[PDB]
Amino acid sequence: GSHSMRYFFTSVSRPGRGEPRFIAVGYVDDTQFVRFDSDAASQRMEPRAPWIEQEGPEYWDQETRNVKAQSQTDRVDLGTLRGYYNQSEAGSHTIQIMYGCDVGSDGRFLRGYRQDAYDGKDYIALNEDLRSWTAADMAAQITKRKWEAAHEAEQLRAYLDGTCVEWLRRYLENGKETLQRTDPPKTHMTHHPISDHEATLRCWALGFYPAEITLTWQRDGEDQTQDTELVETRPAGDGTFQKWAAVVVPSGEEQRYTCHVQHEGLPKPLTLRW
C-alpha cells in the first residue's frame, strides 16, 4: 500500500521560567521512530523503533545537529511572532510544525506537505503545488514575504520531492517486517444488564490495523440503528487499534440485533449476533 513520513515539532515558551520546551518526533505511518526532547540529558536524536537503530554514527550526528538547529529557529520565531501580534512577554506561546511526504506502493511521490501553527491555529502553509504559500493572517503575511524573498519554496520542494521519498523508501524496506501492516479486527460481543429490562450489548474490534474501521448496529435486519454509543478509536500500544460500539436493548429481543464490522483486513464484512 501507500505510506507516509512526517516530522512533528513543538516549541512552547515558558517566560521567566526557562527556555522554550522543544519536542520533535519522526513518524513512518503511525509508528514513531525517532525523537528529541529538550529536557533529555542526552541532547541527541534518539531511536524509537528497532529498524532505525542500525543507522550509523554519521546518521545520528547529522540528525542531532539538524534537529537542534530547528529548535533554535523556533526559539527565535517565538520572539518574532509575539512581536508581530503585540502580545505581552509574560504569556506562554506555541509553535507547531509538520512536514513530510506520501509515497505509493511503487515508492514514488504522491504529495508533500509543510504547515505551521501559532497557538493552535493555522499560521502559514505550503500549498499542494509545493510552489506557493498560504498565510492565515496579516502577521503570517510578513513571514510569507520573507519566505518568498528567500526562495524557500524551491529548496523545500527539493526535499519533499527528493530526499524525503528516498529515505521513506529506505525506512519502509529496512523495517518492512516489524512495521505494522494489515491486521484484521478480532471481534466479539459482550452483554451487560443494567436492569432486567434493559441490557447493554457491546461490539468489540481489537488488534486491528490500520485504524480505519466501521462498526454499525442493526435491529431486525436489515434495519440500521442510531441511539447507540461509540468510543473513539484508540491505540492499543502495540501498533494496533481498538474500538467498540454499544446499544441499549430491551431484555427481549437481544437476539434481534446484529453488529457489523468493516475493515480492509477482513475477507468479508463480519456480522455478530448475540
Partner: peptide, 10 residues
Amino acid sequence: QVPLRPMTYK
C-alpha cells in the same frame, strides 16, 4: 532524515 537546514527566520 530531516532537511539539512531549517527555514529562514519567520
